[PDB]
Design a protein around this ligand. Sequence first.
Ligand SMILES: [Zn+2]
Length: 258
Amino acid sequence: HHWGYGKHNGPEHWHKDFPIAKGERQSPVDIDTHTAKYDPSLKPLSVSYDQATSLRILNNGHAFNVEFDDSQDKAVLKGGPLDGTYRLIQFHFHWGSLDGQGSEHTVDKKKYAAELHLVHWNTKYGDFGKAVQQPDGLAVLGIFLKVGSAKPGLQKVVDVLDSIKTKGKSADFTNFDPRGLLPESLDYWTYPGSLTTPPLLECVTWIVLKEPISVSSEQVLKFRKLNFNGEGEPEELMVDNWRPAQPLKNRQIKASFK
Ligand SMILES: [Zn+2]
């Protein structure tokens, strides 16, 4: 009876195994654009992905992760609200069964069709497993996906999904450039939060980009053909793998832009 996104094990149940689900800095949240505070002290983001080395793509039973070599400062995030250097370890998406839902964060209650999370860890803690135990351990760049024109830089991901249809499958996935997934503008909101899946640790500085990327209906349809289940188990489509918005509590969302 593992956690998941179903009727009997979904987000409303997670607090029984993970009591931090009811904590003070849980994610995602609704971003109220009119009460977000413009902070002129916030620096521009510095995304240095030119030397990124992707390794593999994996269906882990709740999403698919594209994993990167994080043994050196090859793909790093700096600047913005961050102190120090954060190394990219993996990216994954959350998506819906329908185009009108799928994102985890919302903007003035608006849901997008999907949300991309680029997960980075603070190099001062030496490895990802130690970083998640620290309040400043991770930085997650969140990018919204809306349905419209196709995103050419996403197609290489879409075309490999047939190889990792079921939980536990992996495929080699080298030479993928994550720069093809970024919007034109790097304006952002930021707030302190958590992982949005168990163990729900409160270790994330969230950086949510204002500008969505567009993907085609055909691209997102292919996400919805993945399976939560392993091979030979009954088929359950991997859809609606998003956590609903959590209370903001004593937190202020800051904006890098007016
Ligand atoms: Zn995520």
